[PDB]
A paper describes a structure:
The β-ketoacyl-acyl carrier protein (ACP) synthases, FabB, FabF, and FabH, catalyse the Claisen condensation of fatty acyl-thioesters and malonyl-ACP to form a β-ketoacyl-ACP intermediate elongated by two carbon atoms. The initial cycle of elongation is catalysed by FabH, involving condensation of malonyl-ACP and acetyl-CoA, while subsequent cycles of elongation are performed by FabB or FabF. The active site of all three enzymes consists of a catalytic triad centred around a cysteine residue, with FabB and FabF enzymes both possessing a Cys/His/His catalytic triad1920, while FabH possesses a Cys/His/Asn catalytic triad2122. Here we describe the crystal structures of the Yersinia pestis β-ketoacyl-ACP synthases FabF and FabH, and compare these with the unpublished, deposited structure of FabB, presenting three promising targets for the development of new antimicrobials to combat MDR Y. pestis strains.
Author numbering:
A (entry chain B), B (entry chain A): 2 to 412
The structure:
Amino acid sequence: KRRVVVTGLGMLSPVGNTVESTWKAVLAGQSGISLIDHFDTSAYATRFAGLVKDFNCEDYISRKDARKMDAFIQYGVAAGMQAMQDAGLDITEANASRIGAAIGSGIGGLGLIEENHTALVNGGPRKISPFFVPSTIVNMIAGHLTIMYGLRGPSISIATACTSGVHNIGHAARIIAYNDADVMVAGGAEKASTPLGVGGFGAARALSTRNDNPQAASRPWDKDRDGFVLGDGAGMMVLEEYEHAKKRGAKIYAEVVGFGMSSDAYHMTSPPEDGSGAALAMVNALRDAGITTSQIGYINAHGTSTPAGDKAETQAVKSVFGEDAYKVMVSSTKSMTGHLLGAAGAVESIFTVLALRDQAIPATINLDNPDEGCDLDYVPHDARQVKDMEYTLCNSFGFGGTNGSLVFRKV
Amino acid sequence: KRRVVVTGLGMLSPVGNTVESTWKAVLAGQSGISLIDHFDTSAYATRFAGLVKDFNCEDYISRKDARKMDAFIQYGVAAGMQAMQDAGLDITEANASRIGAAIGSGIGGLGLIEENHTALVNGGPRKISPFFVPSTIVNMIAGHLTIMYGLRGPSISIATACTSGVHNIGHAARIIAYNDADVMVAGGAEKASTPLGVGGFGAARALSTRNDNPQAASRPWDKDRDGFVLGDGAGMMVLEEYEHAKKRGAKIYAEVVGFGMSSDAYHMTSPPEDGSGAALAMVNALRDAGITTSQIGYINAHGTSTPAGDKAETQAVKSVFGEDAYKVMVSSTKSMTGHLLGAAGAVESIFTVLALRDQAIPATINLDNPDEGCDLDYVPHDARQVKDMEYTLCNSFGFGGTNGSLVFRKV
């Protein structure tokens, strides 16, 4: 069996423009939630979001090109480039066929779709950009990155809303484990903080409305949560077959040991009280790892700060772990970053990897008051330091009842 | 080692609302290209497309549900049911965890994004539909289907533009072969005949402009081809593990034996003149099959009717098959259907499977004059009848330079 490892990281988040800066901010509990100011939020019930600050795409992409790609692709490409240099692979003609990509997104280029539509409405079809389609569709990040680095291996893009990042990472490992690839760039990127994005989620009343204290709005498992907080960003991993990485002597962050999947088959947006589908996914990830519930130190929960959702996940954690539950620490970093959607699973899977490296677990900020049936150890306010920890569990449960989990092992 | 077979078919296309009706029209060489009507095409250079005709979604799903769906989700769901009904699956509780879905789309619900955006512009974020997000994002076809039939297994949605159909089917087989599921519903759906969709491809100058003779416009490998014709529809397959299929006495259409992936790493929309990316994908699908070039009877080519693209595919077939290039028959059904994008790989893979069943090969209509560097047997005008064919190859080469090919075996 071919073992798969993480040999390169890159990311853009609301609390940092690099991996390490974001990780520092995460451990120190700094919030990335700000007020939106790039469009008039007068009529909107929600006026804040987790935004990427001081991002200049001209470090990564010339502006001539950056005009041919929606912001979510710009993030994705940037984060991909970070991971590539972090990996330090040599791309040769004998290598190319064996290096590919698995990068997705939940919503994609909403921003550039809005632009082009207004242009169409105002000026007709001839005011539509000739690069409309390549700038907006979900798989164009991998499109840009493969071409940039001359990667000619398998290239896919899984779009499963909030489960994108996890699914992409997971299936990238499957592709490598199947011998179809030796190296994969995997992850997700998102920028749904647009008029339609904020408006759309607002119309569904899935958004928090605590405009008076934005950085306290995201409060998973707290009593006064009123919906999730929207966030932008991109997370990217370089996955590699294990012997291949050592033979070239790469820095090896962690091992991808388990990948489990399931669906709720319940409701399109809300999860089941029981959490059967979420539980199913973790059981599967664990079976894939050949590992028991009592070997897991930390669970990066979905933890979206939604009423129904946060309850479901806990009930699912209790169901799977039984009563290793209270011994195990369960934190959502979404208290800081907000919900990144398609990039959520990728950015959070990086935290679970870094957590193993540094043996430090991020806290769930704004957990001032436990909810009714929320008794587990959510690492309430400050980052713990733990020791001799070896297995991590990363969760994401997306719209459509799509569930996915990854298990990482310390190496 | 787990073998994967096809136990169910369902589809919606420009030439039929069922599989057998579509198949009939394809063998009879009927065109599905019509002039567009659901918006004013006065200012558009291209005013025709392959449209699904006489489709009523209330045949399949109630109008309240119908209301919360973009057209591409409606098509996908309808075809999903057809496949499930054809499969004759007994969904019990234990069974349920072992059945999932892998259904994608290249562009998704562009139509309803236009509608809600126009509403927003006219009335503000409070006139956005509360079902905006669940009605537009790509992975909601699998979402509805899982809920409908109580499927709790793995659920993904690969969004790789024109290659979506093939990647979804292929990875559905991988999931089954890896043992993460026993049954998988797979395929793609597309509805890009919208003002922004036709305008977007029109802006890129990739579309045909033969408005005077719409049904002769799609003419792959002809000398006077002037771009692809956009098409709509949805194709779906129920994939299943061989032992599981026989034990229940299933209708077995064929075997999924090979799956190849690659990327061009060259340009965002145009393919290279070789061949090389397309060649890689075919070679890998061949290797996956454990099979030689001389064992494949028919190639359902990508064949979009584009100047560069058609020449590239031929050259790709030359390099791979060598001496058998001329012994092998190569046809694109896009001559009649047009290019269905993310549903192209799905609907055509069905043609490759039906070809095995009936030992009949569809022609590529409008082939009046082969191009200069075209020397292969394209099945010029009429459907051919063949015997002893055991292997088929289905190709799809989509934007972003992502390539895929599936190998099917008669059994």
